[PDB]
Structure formats: C-alpha cells, structure tokens
Amino acid sequence: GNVSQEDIIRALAEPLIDDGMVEKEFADHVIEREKQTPTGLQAEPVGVAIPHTMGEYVRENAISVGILTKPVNFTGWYQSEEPVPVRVVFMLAIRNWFDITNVLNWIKRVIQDRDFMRRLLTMNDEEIYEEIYKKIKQAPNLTGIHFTKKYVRHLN
C-alpha cells in the first residue's frame, strides 16, 4: 500500500497537464513506456528514474521533479535483474529526439554530482526549484524548457 509507479507519474504530470505543456492523456502513455522502455538509473546516493515518452502528447518542453522519502522500485534502464530503488524522478516532456538527447546528456551531468543528490534529498520545493533552475541556466546549448516551482513536488 506504499507508493506505486503510476502514482508518481500521475502526480508529476498533473502540473504539466494543468499548465498546458502536455495533453491530458500524457501520463497513461508515460506509464506504458515505463513498462516497455524502463528508465531506472542506478546512482550514488539514491536511484534515479526518467519517465518520458519520445515526444508523443508533448506540446511545450517542460520538466517536473519528484522526491521520495521511501525508495520505490523502477525497473532498470539497463538490464540487471535488480530493480532500482528510486528516490529522485525526472519527468521529461520533450518533443524533439534531437532535443531529447541533449536533455538526457544534461541529466547525466547532474546525476554524477552525488552531493547534489544528497542535498535534493533534504531540500525544500523552493530550494530545489532555484537550484535546478540555475543548472538549466548554467547549461549551454540546452533547448528552451519550462520549469516552475509547481513542477517541484515531494511525494509519498
């Protein structure tokens, strides 16, 4: 009866739905893709997940970020016969495969800093907003994206 994959994705998508960045159906397709193309990435402090479609049902590029106090199993992006305990989730709403690849490459650099992840595990919605907002600013050649404080949410 603890948090389940569908809940995080639906939770994360709600402000994107509410703000018009993706279509209303968008979460159900993220969930389908997670069954088919899992996005669980083992990392230093805690596990990471990047639920995303390949651009379907996305209307303006946006991101929503979710922090989990208790870990949740997401099947690994790479095959390991070992589920990934996730506490950080990056929901991607990107339309262009070209733009996609840039954003996941930027995603990687963020994950490699473990103390940032340790910080994000104990930080406020406002703190994670302006911290992430800055990293988007400090990211070069990154496409235009949409990030608001509502896009930051604690879960579970």
Partner: antibody
Framework: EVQLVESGGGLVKPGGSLRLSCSAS????????MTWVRQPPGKGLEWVGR??????????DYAAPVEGRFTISRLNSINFLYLEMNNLRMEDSGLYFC??????????????????????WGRGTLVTVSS | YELTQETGVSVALGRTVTITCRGD??????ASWYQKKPGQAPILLFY???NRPSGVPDRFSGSASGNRASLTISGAQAEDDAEYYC????????????FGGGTKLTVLS
C-alpha cells in the same frame, strides 16, 4: 511482418526526373523515421537522406551530393515514402532502398544526437541513367 | 571515407574473424553493422553497445574502442560469405549518416 515495397525506378536519361515510392506495412509507419539508401553498380552503400517524424516537424536531412536536387516526403494516410529526383545523372544510377530507421542513444556514454540504425529494408528499385 | 574498412577479408569454415571500422566519429558515436548479399536486402546485425536484433545469430557480435568499431563472427559459416558495411555519424554531433566502404568476407567453405 514488416514489408517495404519500392517502386518507381526504371530507365531514364541524364537531366531527367523520377519519383520513387515505398509502401510500408507491419509497423507504426506514421511515427517512424524512414531513410533512402543507394548502391551504385559495383560500389557500396551510400546514405541518401532521412525524414523524421511528427515530433521533429517531418524535417529532412540530405547527403551533400543530392542536397538541392532530391526531395523526400511522406503520406502517412497510405504509409508511403517518396523520393523525387531531379537533374539525374549517370552518377546517380543504381539500386535505391527504403529503410526503417531506429534511434539509439546510450545514456551513460552517448553523445547527442545519438545514432540512427536501419532495422528493416526493402529489396529495392533500380534506376538506370544512361544515354 | 570518414569510416574505413578492410577491402576484403578471408576465413575458414568454423573459424573466427573480426572486421573493423575506423573513424573519428566512432570515438563519440557507436556503429551498426549490415550484411549484404548479391541480389538481397541488407540485414541489420548489430548496433549500439551490445544490441543484436532478434533473429540475428549469436555468432555475430560487436565492440567499440577508441576510433575503432569492430564486428566479430564466431564459427563462420558459408551463409556468412557476404559483404559487410558499418554505419555511424560522419562528424561528432551530426544529424547526417555515412556508410563505410564495405568488407567482402570470404568464408572458404
């Protein structure tokens, strides 16, 4: 399963025009990337160009030799891929295939814009340019 | 050719052979491999880090290192007597694609 039929090749003279067509079945054509490849007689595969999907605005990328002379297009309501060729030369003769094109980007070690691979091909259509 | 392949390579039935593709883009991009027989459509064999399509025999395998991508056949057979092409981006960061010259594989069967 996947079926790709090419059509439109044939005998044509220098400076002429030709429209090639490819009919697709057995997969999600409307959202797939589609590629034209050619093989001159005696020679190797040569990448011609590639049309993307709806998220990419159906943008097309062209090999430098054919840029400005060939146009790639699609009709997703009948699952057709087209290559319209103008100012054809002998140098353009050979056997043309459509390929279904996948997208690959490894997360930890990949570098954008990833790599494109060709998971299904047709048997091809022959375009002969001679005088 | 940004991608360079041996013009031709020969091998004995049941023996192991490796074909290589060399280029600067291969230091930043993986490569895929295709088999091409006369009068026949190319067959995709291998792509990415360790991606072998369902249906390709397991005797086919890929590897990359530096500016060099390579394909290996383990227990070569007469059906593997064919022509072999690599593909990758031309430059680092490019939306265009290129094929190597090709390698004629002769399985002395």
């Amino acid at each position: 399963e996947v079926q790709l039929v090419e059509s439109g090749g044939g005998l044509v003279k220098p400076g002429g025009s030709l429209r090639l067509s490819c009919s697709a079945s057995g997969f999600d054509f409307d959202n797939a990337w589609m590629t034209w490849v050619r093989q001159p007689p005696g020679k190797g595969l040569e990448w011609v160009g590639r049309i993307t999907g709806p998220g990419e605005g159906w943008s097309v990328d062209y090999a430098a030799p054919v840029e400005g002379r060939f146009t790639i297009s699609r009709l997703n309501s009948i699952n057709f891929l087209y290559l319209e060729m103008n100012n054809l030369r002998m140098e353009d003769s050979g056997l043309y295939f459509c390929a279904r094109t996948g997208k690959y980007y490894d997360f930890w070690s990949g570098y954008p814009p990833g790599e494109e691979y060709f998971q299904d091909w047709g048997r091809g259509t022959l375009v002969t340019v001679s005088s | 050719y940004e991608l360079t392949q041996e013009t031709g390579v020969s091998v004995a039935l049941g023996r192991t052979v490796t074909i290589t593709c060399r280029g600067d883009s291969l230091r930043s991009h993986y490569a895929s491999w295709y088999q091409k027989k006369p009068g026949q459509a190319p067959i995709l064999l291998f792509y990415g880090k360790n991606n072998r399509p369902s249906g390709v025999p397991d005797r086919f395998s890929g590897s990359a290192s530096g500016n060099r991508a390579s394909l290996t056949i383990s227990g070569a057979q007469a059906e593997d007597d064919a022509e072999y092409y690599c593909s990758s981006r031309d430059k680092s960061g490019s939306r265009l694609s290129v094929f190597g010259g090709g390698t004629k594989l002769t399985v002395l069967s």
